[PDB]
Coordinates of C-alpha atoms and ligand atoms in Angstrom, one line a residue:
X1 CA 43.1 49.2 -19.5
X2 CA 40.5 46.8 -17.9
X3 CA 40.6 46.5 -14.2
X4 CA 43.2 44.3 -12.3
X5 CA 42.2 40.6 -11.5
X6 CA 40.7 40.5 -7.9
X7 CA 41.5 37.8 -5.3
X8 CA 38.6 36.3 -3.4
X9 CA 39.4 36.7 0.4
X10 CA 39.6 33.7 2.5
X11 CA 36.4 33.4 4.6
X12 CA 33.3 31.3 5.2
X13 CA 31.8 29.7 2.1
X14 CA 28.8 27.8 3.4
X15 CA 25.5 29.6 4.0
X16 CA 21.8 28.3 4.7
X17 CA 18.4 29.2 3.7
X18 CA 17.1 27.3 6.7
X19 CA 19.6 27.9 9.4
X20 CA 20.2 25.5 12.3
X21 CA 21.3 27.3 15.5
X22 CA 24.3 25.3 16.8
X23 CA 23.6 26.2 20.6
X24 CA 20.0 25.8 21.1
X25 CA 18.0 22.8 22.2
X26 CA 14.3 24.1 21.8
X27 CA 13.0 23.4 18.3
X28 CA 11.7 27.0 17.8
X29 CA 15.2 28.4 18.3
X30 CA 16.9 25.5 16.7
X31 CA 15.5 26.1 13.2
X32 CA 15.3 29.4 11.5
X33 CA 13.6 29.5 8.1
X34 CA 14.5 32.5 6.0
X35 CA 13.4 33.6 2.5
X36 CA 17.0 33.4 1.3
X37 CA 20.6 32.8 2.6
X38 CA 22.6 35.9 3.6
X39 CA 25.7 35.3 1.7
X40 CA 29.0 37.4 2.1
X41 CA 32.2 37.7 -0.2
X42 CA 35.2 39.8 0.2
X43 CA 38.1 40.5 -2.0
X44 CA 41.5 42.3 -2.5
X45 CA 43.2 43.7 -5.6
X46 CA 47.0 43.2 -5.4
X47 CA 47.8 44.5 -9.1
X48 CA 46.2 47.2 -11.3
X49 CA 43.2 49.4 -11.2
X50 CA 40.4 48.5 -9.0
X51 CA 37.7 49.4 -11.7
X52 CA 34.6 51.4 -11.0
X53 CA 31.9 48.6 -10.5
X54 CA 32.4 45.3 -8.4
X55 CA 30.1 42.4 -9.1
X56 CA 29.4 39.2 -7.4
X57 CA 28.8 36.5 -10.0
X58 CA 26.9 33.0 -9.3
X59 CA 27.5 30.7 -12.3
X60 CA 28.1 34.0 -14.5
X61 CA 25.0 35.6 -13.1
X62 CA 25.2 38.6 -11.1
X63 CA 24.1 38.5 -7.4
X64 CA 25.2 42.0 -6.4
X65 CA 26.8 44.9 -7.9
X66 CA 28.1 48.1 -6.4
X67 CA 30.6 51.0 -6.7
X68 CA 34.3 49.7 -6.5
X69 CA 35.9 52.2 -4.2
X70 CA 39.2 50.7 -2.9
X71 CA 41.6 47.8 -3.0
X72 CA 39.4 45.5 -0.6
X73 CA 35.7 45.0 -0.7
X74 CA 32.8 43.1 0.8
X75 CA 29.5 42.2 -0.6
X76 CA 26.5 41.1 1.4
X77 CA 23.6 39.9 -0.6
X78 CA 20.7 37.2 -0.6
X79 CA 20.5 34.0 -2.5
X80 CA 17.3 32.3 -2.5
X81 CA 17.9 28.9 -4.1
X82 CA 19.9 26.2 -2.9
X83 CA 23.0 24.8 -4.9
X84 CA 26.7 24.8 -5.0
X85 CA 27.7 27.8 -7.1
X86 CA 31.0 28.8 -8.7
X87 CA 31.3 32.4 -7.3
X88 CA 33.5 35.1 -8.9
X89 CA 34.1 38.7 -8.0
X90 CA 34.5 40.8 -11.2
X91 CA 35.8 44.4 -11.4
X92 CA 34.5 46.3 -14.4
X93 CA 35.0 49.6 -15.8
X94 CA 34.4 51.3 -19.2
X95 CA 37.3 49.2 -20.7
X96 CA 36.1 45.8 -19.8
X97 CA 35.4 43.4 -16.7
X98 CA 38.0 41.2 -15.1
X99 CA 36.8 38.2 -13.1
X100 CA 38.6 36.4 -10.3
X101 CA 39.0 32.6 -10.4
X102 CA 36.0 30.9 -9.0
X103 CA 35.4 29.7 -5.6
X104 CA 32.7 27.3 -4.9
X105 CA 30.1 28.4 -2.4
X106 CA 27.3 26.5 -0.6
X107 CA 23.8 27.7 -0.3
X108 CA 22.2 25.0 1.7
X109 CA 18.5 24.2 1.6
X110 CA 16.4 21.3 3.1
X111 CA 15.9 19.7 -0.4
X112 CA 19.5 18.7 -0.3
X113 CA 20.1 20.9 -3.5
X114 CA 23.6 21.8 -1.9
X115 CA 24.6 18.0 -1.2
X116 CA 26.6 15.5 -3.3
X117 CA 24.3 12.5 -3.7
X118 CA 24.5 9.7 -1.0
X119 CA 25.0 6.6 -3.2
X120 CA 26.5 3.9 -1.0
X121 CA 27.1 0.4 -1.7
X122 CA 24.7 -2.4 -0.4
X123 CA 26.0 -4.1 2.6
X124 CA 25.7 -7.3 4.3
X125 CA 23.3 -9.8 2.2
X126 CA 21.6 -6.9 0.4
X127 CA 21.3 -7.7 -3.5
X128 CA 20.2 -5.1 -5.9
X129 CA 16.7 -4.6 -7.2
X130 CA 15.0 -2.4 -9.7
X131 CA 11.7 -1.0 -8.5
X132 CA 9.6 -2.1 -11.4
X133 CA 6.9 -4.0 -10.1
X134 CA 4.6 -0.9 -9.3
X135 CA 4.2 -2.4 -5.7
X136 CA 5.2 -0.6 -2.4
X137 CA 8.2 -1.7 -0.8
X138 CA 8.7 0.2 2.4
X139 CA 10.7 0.1 5.6
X140 CA 11.0 2.3 8.9
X141 CA 14.3 3.7 9.9
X142 CA 14.4 4.7 13.6
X143 CA 16.0 7.9 14.8
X144 CA 17.7 6.6 17.8
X145 CA 19.0 3.6 15.9
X146 CA 22.3 5.8 15.1
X147 CA 23.5 5.1 18.8
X148 CA 23.7 1.6 20.3
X149 CA 22.5 0.1 17.0
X150 CA 25.0 2.2 15.2
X151 CA 22.7 2.0 12.0
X152 CA 22.9 5.2 10.2
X153 CA 21.1 6.5 6.7
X154 CA 24.0 5.5 4.7
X155 CA 23.7 1.8 5.5
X156 CA 20.0 1.8 4.2
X157 CA 19.6 -0.3 1.1
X158 CA 17.9 2.6 -0.5
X159 CA 17.6 1.4 -4.0
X160 CA 15.6 -1.5 -2.9
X161 CA 12.8 0.6 -1.4
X162 CA 10.0 2.8 -2.8
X163 CA 9.2 4.2 0.6
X164 CA 11.4 5.0 3.5
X165 CA 9.6 5.8 6.8
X166 CA 11.3 7.9 9.6
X167 CA 10.2 6.8 13.1
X168 CA 9.4 9.1 14.6
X169 CA 8.2 12.6 14.7
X170 CA 6.7 13.7 18.1
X171 CA 3.8 16.0 18.9
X172 CA 4.6 18.5 21.6
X173 CA 2.9 18.2 24.9
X174 CA 3.8 17.7 28.7
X175 CA 1.8 16.0 31.5
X176 CA -1.5 14.4 30.5
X177 CA -0.5 14.7 26.7
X178 CA 2.8 12.5 26.4
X179 CA 2.8 10.5 29.5
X180 CA 3.6 7.2 27.7
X181 CA 7.1 8.7 27.1
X182 CA 7.8 8.7 30.9
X183 CA 8.2 4.8 30.8
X184 CA 11.4 5.6 28.9
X185 CA 14.4 7.1 30.6
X186 CA 15.0 10.6 29.6
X187 CA 12.6 10.6 26.7
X188 CA 9.7 12.7 28.2
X189 CA 12.2 15.3 29.3
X190 CA 13.9 15.3 25.9
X191 CA 10.6 16.3 24.4
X192 CA 9.8 19.0 26.9
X193 CA 13.1 20.5 26.1
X194 CA 12.6 20.3 22.4
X195 CA 9.2 21.7 22.8
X196 CA 10.2 24.7 25.1
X197 CA 8.3 27.7 24.0
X198 CA 6.2 25.8 21.3
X199 CA 2.5 25.2 21.5
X200 CA 1.3 21.7 22.6
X201 CA -0.2 19.6 19.7
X202 CA 2.6 20.9 17.3
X203 CA 4.9 18.5 15.6
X204 CA 8.8 18.8 16.6
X205 CA 11.8 16.7 16.6
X206 CA 12.5 14.3 19.6
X207 CA 16.4 14.0 19.3
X208 CA 17.6 17.2 17.5
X209 CA 21.2 16.1 17.9
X210 CA 20.5 12.7 16.0
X211 CA 18.4 14.3 13.4
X212 CA 20.4 17.3 12.5
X213 CA 23.9 17.6 14.2
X214 CA 25.5 14.2 14.8
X215 CA 28.5 14.0 12.2
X216 CA 27.7 11.3 9.6
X217 CA 29.0 10.2 6.2
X218 CA 29.0 13.0 3.7
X219 CA 27.9 15.5 6.4
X220 CA 31.2 15.6 8.6
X221 CA 32.5 19.1 8.0
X222 CA 32.1 21.5 11.0
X223 CA 30.3 24.1 8.8
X224 CA 27.9 21.7 6.8
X225 CA 24.6 23.3 7.6
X226 CA 22.8 20.0 8.1
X227 CA 24.1 16.9 9.7
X228 CA 22.7 13.8 11.4
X229 CA 19.8 11.8 10.0
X230 CA 18.0 14.6 8.1
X231 CA 21.4 15.9 6.4
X232 CA 21.8 12.3 5.2
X233 CA 18.3 11.9 4.2
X234 CA 18.7 15.1 1.9
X235 CA 21.8 13.6 0.3
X236 CA 20.0 10.3 0.0
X237 CA 17.1 12.0 -1.7
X238 CA 19.7 13.5 -4.3
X239 CA 21.0 9.9 -5.0
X240 CA 17.4 8.6 -5.0
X241 CA 14.9 11.3 -6.5
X242 CA 11.9 9.0 -6.7
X243 CA 12.3 7.4 -3.1
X244 CA 9.4 8.5 -1.0
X245 CA 10.7 9.6 2.3
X246 CA 7.8 10.0 4.9
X247 CA 8.0 11.4 8.3
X248 CA 6.2 9.1 10.7
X249 CA 4.2 10.8 13.5
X250 CA 3.3 8.7 16.4
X251 CA 4.2 5.2 17.1
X252 CA 3.9 3.3 20.3
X253 CA 5.1 5.9 22.8
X254 CA 4.3 9.1 20.9
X255 CA 0.5 8.3 20.1
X256 CA -1.1 9.9 23.3
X257 CA -1.7 13.3 21.8
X258 CA -3.9 12.0 18.9
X259 CA -6.6 11.0 21.6
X260 CA -7.1 14.8 22.2
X261 CA -7.7 15.7 18.4
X262 CA -11.4 15.5 18.7
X263 CA -10.9 19.2 19.6
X264 CA -10.7 20.8 16.2
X265 CA -8.7 23.6 17.8
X266 CA -6.1 21.2 18.6
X267 CA -6.4 19.3 15.3
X268 CA -6.2 22.4 13.3
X269 CA -3.1 23.3 15.2
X270 CA -1.5 20.0 14.5
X271 CA -2.3 19.8 10.7
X272 CA -1.0 23.4 10.2
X273 CA 2.3 22.4 12.1
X274 CA 2.6 19.2 9.8
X275 CA 2.2 21.7 6.8
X276 CA 5.0 24.1 8.2
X277 CA 7.1 21.1 8.8
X278 CA 7.0 19.9 5.3
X279 CA 7.6 23.5 4.1
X280 CA 10.6 23.5 6.3
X281 CA 12.2 20.1 5.6
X282 CA 11.6 19.8 1.9
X283 CA 13.3 16.4 1.6
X284 CA 10.1 14.8 3.0
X285 CA 7.4 13.5 0.4
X286 CA 4.3 13.7 2.9
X287 CA 3.1 12.3 6.2
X288 CA 2.6 8.9 7.9
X289 CA 0.2 8.8 10.7
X290 CA 0.9 6.2 13.2
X291 CA -1.8 6.5 15.8
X292 CA -1.8 3.4 18.2
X293 CA -4.6 3.2 18.3
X294 CA -8.0 4.8 17.9
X295 CA -10.2 3.5 20.6
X296 CA -7.3 3.0 23.0
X297 CA -5.3 -0.2 24.0
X298 CA -2.0 1.6 23.0
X299 CA 0.5 2.3 25.5
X300 CA -1.7 4.5 27.7
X301 CA -4.2 2.4 29.6
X302 CA -6.2 5.7 30.4
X303 CA -6.8 6.9 26.9
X304 CA -9.2 5.9 24.0
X305 CA -12.8 7.1 23.4
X306 CA -15.7 5.7 21.0
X307 CA -15.2 9.2 19.2
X308 CA -11.7 8.1 18.1
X309 CA -13.0 6.7 14.7
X310 CA -14.6 9.8 13.7
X311 CA -11.6 11.9 14.7
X312 CA -9.3 9.6 12.7
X313 CA -11.3 10.0 9.5
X314 CA -11.7 13.9 10.1
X315 CA -7.8 13.9 10.7
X316 CA -7.1 12.2 7.4
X317 CA -9.4 14.3 5.5
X318 CA -8.1 17.5 6.8
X319 CA -4.3 16.2 6.1
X320 CA -5.3 15.3 2.8
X321 CA -6.7 18.9 2.1
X322 CA -3.7 20.6 3.5
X323 CA -1.3 18.2 1.3
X324 CA -3.4 19.0 -1.8
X325 CA -2.8 22.6 -1.2
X326 CA 0.9 22.1 -0.5
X327 CA 1.0 20.0 -4.0
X328 CA -0.6 22.9 -5.7
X329 CA 1.9 25.3 -4.2
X330 CA 4.8 23.2 -5.0
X331 CA 3.9 21.2 -7.9
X332 CA 5.0 17.8 -6.2
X333 CA 3.0 15.0 -5.2
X334 CA 2.6 14.4 -1.6
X335 CA 1.5 11.2 0.2
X336 CA -0.6 10.5 3.2
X337 CA -0.3 7.1 4.7
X338 CA -1.0 5.5 8.1
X339 CA 0.4 2.4 9.9
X340 CA -2.5 0.7 11.6
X341 CA -3.5 -2.3 14.0
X342 CA -4.1 -5.5 11.9
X343 CA -6.2 -6.9 14.8
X344 CA -9.9 -7.0 13.6
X345 CA -11.1 -5.5 16.9
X346 CA -9.0 -2.5 16.5
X347 CA -9.9 -2.3 12.6
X348 CA -13.4 -2.2 13.5
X349 CA -13.3 1.1 15.4
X350 CA -12.5 3.0 12.3
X351 CA -14.4 3.3 9.0
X352 CA -11.3 2.7 6.7
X353 CA -13.6 2.5 3.9
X354 CA -14.2 6.0 4.3
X355 CA -10.8 7.3 5.4
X356 CA -9.1 5.6 2.3
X357 CA -10.5 8.2 0.0
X358 CA -7.8 10.6 1.7
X359 CA -5.2 8.1 2.0
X360 CA -2.3 6.7 -0.5
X361 CA -1.4 3.7 1.5
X362 CA -2.7 1.8 4.6
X363 CA 0.6 0.2 6.3
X364 CA -1.2 -2.9 7.8
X365 CA 0.8 -3.7 11.0
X366 CA 0.6 -7.5 10.5
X367 CA 3.1 -8.3 13.2
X368 CA 3.2 -8.4 17.0
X369 CA 0.2 -10.7 16.9
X370 CA 1.9 -12.6 20.0
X371 CA 4.8 -12.2 22.1
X372 CA 6.5 -12.0 25.6
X373 CA 3.7 -9.4 26.7
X374 CA 1.5 -12.6 27.1
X375 CA 3.2 -15.7 28.6
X376 CA 0.0 -18.0 28.6
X377 CA -1.2 -17.8 24.9
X378 CA 1.6 -18.5 22.4
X379 CA 1.4 -18.2 18.6
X380 CA 3.1 -17.0 15.5
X381 CA 3.9 -13.1 15.7
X382 CA 3.5 -12.3 12.1
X383 CA 1.9 -15.3 10.2
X384 CA -0.1 -15.0 6.9
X385 CA -2.5 -17.8 8.1
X386 CA -3.7 -19.6 11.3
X387 CA -1.8 -22.6 12.1
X388 CA -3.1 -26.2 11.8
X389 CA -3.3 -26.5 15.6
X390 CA -5.7 -23.6 16.0
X391 CA -7.3 -22.7 12.8
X392 CA -9.5 -20.1 14.5
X393 CA -6.5 -18.2 15.6
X394 CA -7.7 -14.4 15.8
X395 CA -4.6 -12.6 14.9
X396 CA -3.4 -13.4 11.5
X397 CA -2.4 -11.3 8.5
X398 CA -5.4 -12.6 6.4
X399 CA -7.8 -11.8 9.2
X400 CA -6.7 -8.2 9.1
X401 CA -6.7 -7.8 5.4
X402 CA -10.1 -9.6 5.3
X403 CA -11.5 -7.0 8.0
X404 CA -10.5 -4.2 5.7
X405 CA -11.8 -5.7 2.5
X406 CA -15.0 -6.4 4.3
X407 CA -15.3 -2.7 5.3
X408 CA -15.0 -1.9 1.6
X409 CA -11.3 -0.9 1.6
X410 CA -9.9 -1.2 -2.1
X411 CA -7.2 -4.0 -2.2
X412 CA -4.6 -1.7 -3.8
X413 CA -4.4 0.5 -0.6
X414 CA -3.4 -2.3 1.5
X415 CA 0.4 -2.7 2.3
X416 CA 1.1 -5.8 4.3
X417 CA 3.6 -5.9 7.1
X418 CA 6.6 -8.1 7.6
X419 CA 8.7 -8.3 10.5
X420 CA 12.8 -7.8 10.6
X421 CA 12.8 -8.9 14.2
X422 CA 11.4 -12.1 16.1
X423 CA 9.5 -12.1 19.5
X424 CA 10.1 -14.7 22.0
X425 CA 9.7 -16.6 25.3
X426 CA 12.1 -18.6 27.6
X427 CA 11.1 -21.6 29.7
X428 CA 8.3 -22.8 27.3
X429 CA 6.9 -26.0 28.7
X430 CA 3.6 -28.1 28.9
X431 CA 3.2 -28.4 25.0
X432 CA 1.7 -31.4 23.2
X433 CA 2.6 -33.2 20.0
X434 CA 6.1 -31.4 19.6
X435 CA 4.4 -28.0 19.0
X436 CA 6.0 -25.5 21.4
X437 CA 3.0 -23.0 20.9
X438 CA 0.6 -25.2 22.5
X439 CA 2.5 -24.7 26.0
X440 CA 3.0 -21.7 28.3
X441 CA 6.3 -19.7 29.0
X442 CA 7.9 -18.3 32.2
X443 CA 9.4 -15.1 30.7
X444 CA 10.7 -13.3 27.8
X445 CA 13.5 -14.5 25.4
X446 CA 16.7 -12.7 26.1
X447 CA 16.7 -10.0 23.4
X448 CA 19.2 -8.2 21.4
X449 CA 18.4 -4.7 22.6
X450 CA 15.4 -5.3 24.8
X451 CA 14.0 -8.5 26.5
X452 CA 11.5 -10.6 24.4
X453 CA 12.7 -9.3 20.9
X454 CA 15.5 -10.3 18.7
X455 CA 16.8 -8.7 15.5
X456 CA 16.5 -11.0 12.3
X457 CA 20.2 -10.5 11.8
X458 CA 21.0 -12.2 15.2
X459 CA 18.3 -15.0 14.7
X460 CA 20.1 -15.7 11.3
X461 CA 23.7 -15.6 12.7
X462 CA 23.2 -17.0 16.2
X463 CA 20.1 -19.2 16.4
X464 CA 20.5 -21.7 13.5
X465 CA 23.0 -23.8 15.0
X466 CA 23.7 -26.1 18.1
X467 CA 20.5 -27.2 19.7
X468 CA 18.2 -24.9 17.9
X469 CA 15.5 -26.7 16.0
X470 CA 14.3 -24.8 13.0
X471 CA 10.6 -25.4 11.6
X472 CA 8.8 -23.8 8.8
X473 CA 5.0 -24.0 9.4
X474 CA 3.6 -24.1 5.9
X475 CA 0.0 -23.8 6.9
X476 CA 0.5 -20.5 8.8
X477 CA 3.6 -19.5 6.6
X478 CA 5.6 -18.9 9.5
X479 CA 9.1 -19.9 10.7
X480 CA 10.4 -20.7 14.3
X481 CA 13.5 -21.8 16.2
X482 CA 13.2 -23.6 19.5
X483 CA 15.9 -24.6 22.1
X484 CA 14.1 -27.3 24.3
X485 CA 16.5 -27.6 27.0
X486 CA 16.2 -23.9 28.1
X487 CA 12.5 -23.7 26.5
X488 CA 13.7 -20.7 24.2
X489 CA 11.1 -20.1 21.6
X490 CA 11.4 -17.4 18.7
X491 CA 8.7 -16.4 16.3
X492 CA 9.8 -14.3 13.2
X493 CA 9.6 -13.8 9.3
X494 CA 12.1 -15.4 7.0
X495 CA 12.8 -15.3 3.3
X496 CA 10.1 -18.0 2.9
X497 CA 7.3 -16.4 5.0
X498 CA 8.1 -13.2 3.2
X499 CA 7.8 -14.9 -0.1
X500 CA 4.5 -16.1 0.9
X501 CA 3.3 -12.8 1.8
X502 CA 4.5 -11.3 -1.5
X503 CA 2.8 -14.0 -3.6
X504 CA -0.4 -13.3 -1.4
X505 CA 0.0 -9.7 -2.2
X506 CA 0.1 -10.4 -5.8
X507 CA -2.7 -13.0 -5.8
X508 CA -5.1 -10.4 -4.0
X509 CA -3.9 -7.2 -5.7
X510 CA -2.8 -5.6 -2.6
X511 CA -0.5 -2.7 -2.4
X512 CA 2.9 -4.2 -1.7
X513 CA 4.8 -5.0 1.4
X514 CA 6.5 -2.8 4.2
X515 CA 8.7 -3.8 7.2
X516 CA 9.7 -2.7 10.7
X517 CA 12.5 -2.0 11.3
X518 CA 15.5 -1.5 8.6
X519 CA 18.6 -1.9 11.0
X520 CA 17.6 -5.3 12.0
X521 CA 17.6 -7.0 8.7
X522 CA 20.8 -8.6 7.3
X523 CA 19.3 -8.3 3.7
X524 CA 17.3 -11.5 3.6
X525 CA 14.2 -10.0 4.4
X526 CA 14.3 -7.1 2.1
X527 CA 15.8 -9.3 -0.7
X528 CA 12.7 -11.4 -0.4
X529 CA 10.2 -8.5 -0.2
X530 CA 11.6 -7.2 -3.4
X531 CA 11.8 -10.7 -5.3
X532 CA 8.4 -11.8 -4.1
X533 CA 6.7 -8.9 -5.3
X534 CA 8.3 -9.5 -8.7
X535 CA 10.9 -6.6 -8.9
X536 CA 13.9 -7.5 -11.3
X537 CA 17.4 -8.0 -10.0
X538 CA 20.5 -5.8 -10.9
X539 CA 21.3 -2.2 -10.3
Ligands
LIG601 C1 10.4 -4.0 20.2 C2 10.6 -2.7 19.5 S1 11.6 -2.7 18.3 N1 10.1 -1.8 20.1 C3 10.3 -0.2 19.5 C4 8.7 0.3 19.2 O1 8.4 -0.2 18.2 C5 7.1 -0.6 17.6 C6 6.3 0.7 16.9 O2 6.3 1.8 17.8 C7 5.0 0.4 16.1 N2 5.0 1.3 15.1 C8 5.3 1.0 13.9 C9 5.3 1.9 12.7 S2 5.7 -0.7 13.7 C10 5.5 -1.0 15.4 O3 6.1 -2.0 16.1 C11 7.3 -1.7 16.6 C12 7.7 -2.9 17.1 O4 6.7 -3.7 17.7 O5 8.8 1.5 19.1 C13 9.1 2.2 20.3 C14 8.8 3.8 20.0 O6 7.3 4.0 19.6 C15 10.4 2.0 20.5 O7 11.1 2.6 21.6 C16 12.2 3.3 21.8 O8 12.8 2.3 22.5 C17 14.3 2.4 22.6 C18 14.9 1.6 23.6 O9 15.1 0.1 23.0 C19 14.7 3.8 23.1 O10 16.0 4.1 23.1 C20 13.9 5.0 22.4 O11 14.3 6.3 22.8 C21 12.4 4.6 22.3 N3 11.9 5.5 21.3 C22 11.0 6.5 21.5 C23 10.5 7.4 20.7 S3 10.4 6.6 23.1 C24 10.8 0.7 20.7 O12 12.2 0.3 20.9
LIG602 C1 -2.9 -9.2 17.9 C2 -2.7 -8.0 18.5 S1 -4.0 -6.9 18.6 N1 -1.7 -7.6 19.3 C3 -1.5 -6.6 20.2 C4 -0.2 -6.0 19.8 O1 -0.4 -5.2 18.6 C5 0.5 -5.0 21.0 O2 1.8 -4.8 20.8 C6 2.1 -4.0 20.2 O3 1.9 -3.7 18.7 C7 2.0 -2.4 18.3 C8 1.6 -2.4 16.9 O4 2.5 -3.1 16.2 C9 3.5 -2.0 18.5 O5 3.4 -0.7 18.0 C10 3.9 -2.1 20.0 O6 5.3 -1.9 20.2 C11 3.2 -3.4 20.7 N2 3.2 -2.9 21.9 C12 3.9 -3.5 22.9 C13 3.8 -3.1 24.4 S2 4.9 -4.5 22.3 C14 0.2 -5.7 22.4 C15 0.5 -4.6 23.4 O7 1.4 -5.2 24.3 O8 -1.0 -6.1 22.5 C16 -1.4 -7.2 21.5 O9 -2.7 -7.8 21.8

């Protein structure tokens, strides 16, 4: 007779090729990369002969074999490819093999190969678009948005994007290296903790809880190897295999380390850490460099050197050569991008006509042109053109694109930025001819999360009734709302200024549009990005 039918023993069924240690706060102990998951299966035989060989089958294929020596057994073996597998124990002798009922097991890997697709319905005013324009449609999702803003990866309108950028991946470094973080409560200490035991100038994860452990839709089971933003991004990738998801390194508060990268020892260390990071977190499709800014005038008033332009071009070249080597190992296409100042004075510190040869896209940060950081000189924060009242306005979108084009940047590389938020002032007074921008302010507008800044969502739902005037400047291509009694003035992008940006992109054969930041939109901004670049409606 063939052997009796074994019963799989109750026990853990989820395993990981990259393991996350659940009691560790240092990135180096938090993440353990192995060549294969260590899987274990046990079984009992309640009736019949135990056979002479026991096998573990995964989808019918043997992963382990050994002598069957008793009524109970355990197999420990390695599985090097992620997936959900129908696992059976089979007992064999000379007269046949008898296989257990299948138990599904999970072998987790950071491509999300073990995850059900995260395919969620569009929310708020988001309408479905097909990505068939061949243009970039990008937005940033912020790591910390999962807390007070309560905006998680399942709320991203992912079908309506070609690029999703994750803000922000930090670079390790204490005093002198990440001093801009100190202006944010607990933020500098969170990075030191994450970077404990890790060399400076290597990438890390700023909030490992938000990135990997916070329970979220699709990753709420205690034994899910990956949770938080990264676990959901993995499942998002499974739903949207052609979405490019790029880790963004830098930003306003995490740019200080770039200023030291004229030292090739530090630069090589950084590039190698980026390579390792992408080998570790397979769901990412490249890297976005957000260095604010070569030459200084970023958050840190003590950094900035004339050497920064040269450092920037060397960094892009070296990152491209590392990515080409990774593409060759893996067979995937990897992208290299950078978010840059749209101000001509900052643009002219870098030879983008040289760096473009390494880069897929330049994300032109054509926003924050004006704001509550200057109470004397008011203007449109994200306009396409100058306004009629000051045609020589320095900071406009067209001036930033023209600076790049004049360098010799190819128009197809240039991705024009739109704002999903407004900037604003209170107490505006002293203006001429009913144009509030010609006056001066006494403070920042009351903000959604921080002073002087309002989510586009709140502008649309709260500041288009009562005493609020609404004006679309058609010369600038720029909307604004104004409440004269309090002098509250807010400058923002709307469906119409975005449509003008998209038309301009098509006119000038630019690369597409991108936006900061995805949690602040109600759908109006992203619908308009998609429509204006000519993407067709419908799922
Ligand atoms: C007004 C806003 S939304 N400021 C956030 C800021 O954003 C910049 C951004 O860095 C720069 N890079 C782009 C890419 S687009 C461009 O413009 C946006 C908006 O002008 O980014 C800061 C981080 O670099 C944000 O800081 C964080 O602030 C929140 C509190 O509001 C805090 O809880 C987080 O811990 C901070 N994140 C850090 C990494 S320090 C800022 O909100
Ligand atoms: C027209 C110019 S050059 N405006 C800058 C403005 O960029 C600065 O701001 C910052 O904008 C960057 C890039 O988008 C953004 O990352 C920062 O969050 C903004 N920094 C703030 C403190 S808001 C601004 C610096 O205050 O200077 C203007 O001149």
